Amino acid sequence: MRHYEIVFMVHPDQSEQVPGMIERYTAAITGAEGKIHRLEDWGRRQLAYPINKLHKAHYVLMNVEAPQEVIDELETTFRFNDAVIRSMVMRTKHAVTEASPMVK
Amino acid sequence: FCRFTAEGVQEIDYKDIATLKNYITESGKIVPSRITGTRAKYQRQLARAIKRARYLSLLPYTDRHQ
Amino acid sequence: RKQVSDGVAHIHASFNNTIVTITDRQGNALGWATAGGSGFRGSRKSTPFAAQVAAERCADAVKEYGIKNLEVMVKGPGPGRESTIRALNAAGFRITNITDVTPIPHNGCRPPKKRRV
Amino acid sequence: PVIKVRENEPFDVALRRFKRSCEKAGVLAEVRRREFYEKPTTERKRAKASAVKRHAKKLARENARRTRLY
Amino acid sequence: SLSTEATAKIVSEFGRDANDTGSTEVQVALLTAQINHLQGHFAEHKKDHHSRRGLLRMVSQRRKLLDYLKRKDVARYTQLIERLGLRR
């Protein structure tokens, strides 16, 4: 199992849908025997440059140990869900559980 | 001066926008290693981090109005 | 007929020519002037002085609008790039912000071939 | 090279900051270089020449110019 | 590349001892497994010439080793190539 690190930015008008979404993604990972090493809702945040003409995207961070098939499925879900503006699944070597600088 | 020397930084983090802002100029451009004094390995790591942040709109690509 | 008080001066300063364009803060152009129309051709319109008189002309043109504050956006490598802003200030606007907006590509389209002179 | 003129800053001073900012950015140099397509070989050759000249000059100054000129 | 556990299993199978890694048979077996594994990859990626260079090197090494076995000890060679199902 490969340690990943997903960060996805959500449309701020759909910020209320975010708790359910987090639950769904985590649930899928667990269902597929995926561990969840850190989970940080960073919330609404000011973009450094306007994406799709809209500012203030809602950032969610998720460091996960999962299989790659499930990572692929998650990526596909991200791409087709017209809610997540950006995503960034990024491989990591170890269990990076400590809290991130943005929460710090 | 090479900030990471005191740590011997374990890994540079693209989310650490606080320090990456020392390694980008006013216009958003990456500062040369010769000017900031970063070690070459670390400089490469930082550049990668900056690029990732730019992708995630944590840092800006350029100094323009928005 | 309208008044705006605060404009943007877009100084397009290519090697051959200087175009000055005063606009409302939104983007809509009020008046413009060039060294070519200012009465300079070739070696004479590719000079700082020509740019200055173009700037003066532009200021005169937009005098109707009664523009008081002005931010200047300089573009391109040019003989003016300075003369125009100096002239504009002399013509008597408060220069608030001066910004460079020269469009650099991030390694994009291929430039034309090198001149053999 | 964005500049905003501060309260009670003279215009000439503002101009000076703007010019300095532009020079630091290196906008004019970038545009001039990107005016025409330099071939990759040409770029490599120029880089090599610059490196050689710089090194040679530095060596000459520091080590060769440690003698009595008069 | 070949996983650690798989490599260990190969070593145990053909290795006189589980700390034996240099044995010719073990070396040949490891190479063969690697080559077999890489077949799928190269079927997918026919233009991966650099990687195919690596594969070719593996093949050459196996041939050289096999030849060494043939001259040294014929019975071992015959048994090994029957076990692995390698032509000649």
Add this chain to the structure above:
Amino acid sequence: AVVKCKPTSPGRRHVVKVVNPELHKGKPFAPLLEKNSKSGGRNNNGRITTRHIGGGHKQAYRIVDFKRNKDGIPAVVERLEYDPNRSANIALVLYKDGERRYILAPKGLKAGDQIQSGVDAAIKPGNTLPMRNIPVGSTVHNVEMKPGKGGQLARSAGTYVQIVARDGAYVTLRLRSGEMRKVEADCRATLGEVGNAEHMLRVLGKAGAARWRGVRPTVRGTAMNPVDHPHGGGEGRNFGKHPVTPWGVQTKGKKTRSNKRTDKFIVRRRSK
């Protein structure tokens, strides 16, 4: 695969077959067949209304499902088949409730594959959903023009359409001709490109092949006598005329679209 036939005769030397071994070597599903007698390009007045049509092979008509209305019930692709009535290949599918149906085969599609029409249907090749549901940018085929009418656009081999925009009730389609066209967003559209893409790589190799496909020989107007064609015929090979159809209307370059009812839907006419 494409296969160059060896030159054992001057009839085979230029032949290029497109051979697909995945097709069904067997008889088609007899409930979906029906009779399809030939016209010879003649209308109900018995007159030749389209030249150069005649003969060829007998052909049963497969009843292909362009409407794609079994919403929700998931089907599975049993087998790919050869359809003589179209360039594309068809696919015999089996709906969970027991109904079988022919559909156009999309790209990559094969036996045992699972497909589903509907709104909830997953975005994957062979699934069919209203074009408001399909992401903008997606390549689609068998596209409907009037909601519920049945796919009309991009039915031919390797064809497809780009959903370039969705503004309200209409999606903008970049059609295969290059044409941009507004279509109602309620119009159905099957994901992916239509299969047998190598169809165009085939080379008939002889006159007989065309004949087998029912195409009778074309006679050049300039071969004819002045009474027969506006290109008449002179002594030797003269021409001197501006090219024209047999019925005397300039050919090559003269536009003929006469349709003001539908111009509102044409966002941009094709180019090149």
Add this chain to the structure above:
RNA sequence: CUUGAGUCUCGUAGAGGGGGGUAGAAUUCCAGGUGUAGCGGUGAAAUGCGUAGAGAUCUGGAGGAAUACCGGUGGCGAAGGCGGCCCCCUGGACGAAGACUGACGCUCAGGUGCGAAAGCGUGGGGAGCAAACAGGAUUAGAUACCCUGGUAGUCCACGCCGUAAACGAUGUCGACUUGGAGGUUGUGCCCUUGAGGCGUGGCUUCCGGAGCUAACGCGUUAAGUCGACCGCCUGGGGAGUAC
């Protein structure tokens, strides 16, 4: 037998290769707003574009190609070559301690593979650039240089071609022979007291001793002292041409 050669364990750095996504800047085009006589170009002009509203400026859209800064006589690769970010597949190099095999090695005529750019075939794509081509200049002429345009091509898939000043103008492998200053990447000890002290490997740049060289220069990455094998040369032209 274990010193050459290889295997296993753990790490390390890397534009190494293949596939698939994606980001921002910029050019072009398209539609719209503002706006008015110029723009463009050059040594100076003209062709060209613009009162049928251009250039300038703001908004939106399309599409292709390439990845600013970082960036380095930096790195990787047998060479050709490789440069945004992300994932999937994948090859090699290097260090540490051990353990294992036990000369399994070096080189290689034929042979086989890889091999920039241009070029070719078939099917796509086509923004920018640009052989050919067109017009404008210059000129004695100007089938050029300069200017305005501009098609193959440059891009993608899969085949072919099989060559370059494909150069370090320096065949591969191994051993031995004074030094200095760097770069890069490991690693051992020293309290890292700080960025730091003393070692020990790999690759790499420059300078220089002996020696070598016609000289220029090379100089522990040799063009020095040697061993193995290969490739190649024997005056200029004719000619890397004819058959």
